[PDB]
Design a protein around this ligand. Sequence first.
Ligand SMILES: Nc1ncnc2c1ncn2[C@@H]1O[C@H](COP(=O)(O)OP(=O)(O)O)[C@@H](O)[C@H]1O
Ligand SMILES: [Ca+2]
Ligand SMILES: [Ca+2]
Lengths: 20, 336
Amino acid sequence: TTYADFIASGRTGRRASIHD
Amino acid sequence: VKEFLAKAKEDFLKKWETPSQNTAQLDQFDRIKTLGTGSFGRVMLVKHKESGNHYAMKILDKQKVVKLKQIEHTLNEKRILQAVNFPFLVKLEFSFKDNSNLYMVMEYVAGGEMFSHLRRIGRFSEPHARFYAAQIVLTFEYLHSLDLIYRDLKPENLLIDQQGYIQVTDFGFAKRVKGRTWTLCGTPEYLAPEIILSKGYNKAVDWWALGVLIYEMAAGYPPFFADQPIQIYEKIVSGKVRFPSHFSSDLKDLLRNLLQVDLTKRFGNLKNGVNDIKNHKWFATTDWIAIYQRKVEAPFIPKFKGPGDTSNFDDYEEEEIRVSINEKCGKEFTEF
Ligand SMILES: Nc1ncnc2c1ncn2[C@@H]1O[C@H](COP(=O)(O)OP(=O)(O)O)[C@@H](O)[C@H]1O
Ligand SMILES: [Ca+2]
Ligand SMILES: [Ca+2]
């Protein structure tokens, strides 16, 4: 499932900004 | 709205043109605990000694700001936040600087980030997501009318207040611009394709990001995700979006119009502006004035147990707030 793929990914916690 | 916005612009411009400075100092507060962090900033719950009130103190190390080339963005952040006024924007109560750091002291919004509730609960029902979305639509109508672009919409930067309403925080990438700009900044999952493809962009990137926000609130995951930003940018640029089985047809239609790679077609960017969004079928039940007036019953009210309670926030490792006896970066931050 897409849910399961999201939860197993490495970006489920708080996300930092980028600024280049 | 046009009369309200006109007066709102007058108020904003007076403060834009003569910003507030130096309205508190560090030893007026006792620092209690870290509430949250971003790539180079830390926000702490503090207590103001003479009033007893709690606040949220954003602390930036000036040398880190310079090293990451974020001086102009940080001056933008404070100049704009001290000048705006809208029911879903966090209030800046004080600001000051010392030899080492910059300080922005906001109202403490105790209900926590939308992010934490969203991940814990899983996803929000469409009425719940819609209540929050309407507040963002109104806030972006306000900000854009001041020629401001916000550029960092995400659940981590949205706080829930004691009545269950949104407070937008983190004006780090806010910028007053007429026409186009080019900085690659934001949060990877929320970037519009025209940001990634470096062609120059305008306030329509905020309406894209609204589409991402609504998707993520209603799905419980973003429309474009992967383990690394470059992989996310690839998906954004493909623009292919797939929807959960439970999304209503109205929500899907709205999102195809917000997550639109073509700027002549993206809602919020057309001839009728924000009204294409306000008048869309998904928002048919939304009373736009009652939302503005905060008279709508919120779908969710976080638990609150007392001044200073932080239980709606994750815990963080704490670090010393050092202040050197030598002034760092004084010229760079003169106007702060
Ligand atoms: N006014 C506030 N009230 C309560 N918590 C806050 C407030 N503002 C920010 N926070 C918390 O601190 C975190 C970081 O603040 P933010 O302004 O986004 O800093 P950064 O620019 O370093 O990401 C937020 O994600 C949230 O957890
Ligand atoms: Ca942030
Ligand atoms: Ca920021």
